[PDB]
Design a binder for this molecule. Structure first.
Ligand SMILES: Nc1nc2c(ncn2[C@@H]2O[C@H](COP(=O)(O)OP(=O)(O)O)[C@@H](O)[C@H]2O)c(=O)[nH]1
Ligand SMILES: Nc1nc2c(ncn2[C@@H]2O[C@H](COP(=O)(O)OP(=O)(O)O)[C@@H](O)[C@H]2O)c(=O)[nH]1
Ligand SMILES: [Mg+2]
Ligand SMILES: [Mg+2]
Ligand SMILES: [Mg+2]
Ligand SMILES: [Mg+2]
Lengths: 205, 203
């Protein structure tokens, strides 16, 4: 097959407007775009949550077939989850000029006390593109899971994080059971379930 | 597993920062710390946009997947094109079931009737900044009936149906041609479960 039909040349962003600015922003995009049946749409407005973009690191120990998870409260999970404390991947915001890999390695140390060896890209995804611009770029990072323990996170920033080490099999079973249910961890761990055999061979050579 | 429960956090208040089609709320809360203490009062800005039902339309006889293409302007700044290849999906309104929304959107967005269904996974899109939860089902479809242009035109919805093989769709995930969370999650799940699913639905 061929894929998508239209490009950036087929949409005109007439205007953007920031409706709220605080730590994050809510922007109004005003645009018109080509229609599949020929013409151009009228003017359309969409509210878009703007919060920057993230680097995500799946810490995988290929010697032990183990993953390191970080636990912290995510209050937005409260209304639809039994607990707002989630088991997650290492992750942080990307600043201007920073690379995904530099952010991933720094956050692995800050959030889990982990040094990272080799890294490989997993996938880069849009979290929920009907309402937010956020893109997250996932790497897998080689770690020694026997070094992973304790409480981390930047305390001067109200970041309180607990490290957990589990087998890959257990982490994936938790995805299947819904005990791990945040997008970044689901995507990373499903990818690991599809790729771990080749990855362990590559990293223990 | 996790350490703390809802007994360990108090939401003191929520403040509406923005109310429009969607909302942005400030949650004010305190919570237990791993070191044994209580936090001070924490605030977080949270994007409130309701919750979604997502349908992976899978034809188990033909081993085919139905994708829908539509513009998502929020993708513009970080993507080659704002037109994305996606799963059928829609907002869940008050009192509706995930499955009822999935079936209605499959008809509106792809002209598809759905047979049997099975849950895939329900996930938080980005819980550091939004409450949004999306519940994915796989739905049995006849992909030969999936074609053409759909979407509710009276709602600025312009949608093109694409049919690909399962292996083709997954290759597109690997290559970055499909790169939205709902589709990546659904198609990775399908790559892990298709053998048993095809057997269940053809025998
Ligand atoms: N005015 C306005 N309407 C929106 C916005 N986002 C979604 N909608 C509405 O959602 C309907 C269909 O769009 P979509 O988001 O794909 O709905 P869904 O498929 O049920 O999730 C249309 O009627 C739009 O009016 C927005 O930012 N502004
Ligand atoms: N006060 C405040 N701080 C925020 C907000 N969003 C992010 N931060 C800060 O950004 C830092 C990293 O964000 P975090 O919550 O850890 O999300 P993550 O980077 O994706 O893991 C934290 O130290 C927070 O203090 C917010 O809405 N309000
Ligand atoms: Mg983080
Ligand atoms: Mg951090
Ligand atoms: Mg939709
Ligand atoms: Mg719809």
């Amino acid at each position: 097959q061929q894929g998508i039909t239209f490009s950036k040349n087929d949409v005109e962003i007439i205007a953007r407007e920031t409706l709220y600015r605080g730590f994050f922003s809510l922007d109004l995009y005003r645009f018109r775009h080509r229609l599949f049946n020929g013409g151009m749409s009228g003017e359309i407005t969409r509210e878009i949550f703007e919060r920057g973009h993230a680097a995500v690191l799946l810490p995988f120990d290929p010697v032990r077939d183990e993953v390191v998870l970080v636990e912290q409260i995510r209050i937005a999970a409260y209304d639809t989850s039994e607990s707002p404390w989630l088991l997650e991947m290492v992750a942080g915001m990307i600043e201007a000029g920073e690379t995904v890999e530099d952010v991933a390695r720094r956050e692995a140390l800050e959030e889990a006390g982990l040094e990272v060896g080799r890294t490989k890209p997993i996938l880069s995804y849009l979290a929920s593109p009907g309402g937010t611009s956020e893109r997250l770029s996932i790497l897998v990072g080689e770690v020694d899971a026997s070094t992973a323990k304790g409480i981390h996170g930047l305390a001067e920033e109200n970041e309180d994080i607990r490290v957990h080490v589990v087998s890959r099999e257990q982490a994936y079973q938790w995805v299947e059971e819904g005990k791990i249910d945040n997008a970044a961890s689901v995507i990373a761990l499903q990818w690991l379930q599809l790729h771990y055999h080749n990855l362990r061979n590559e990293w223990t050579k």
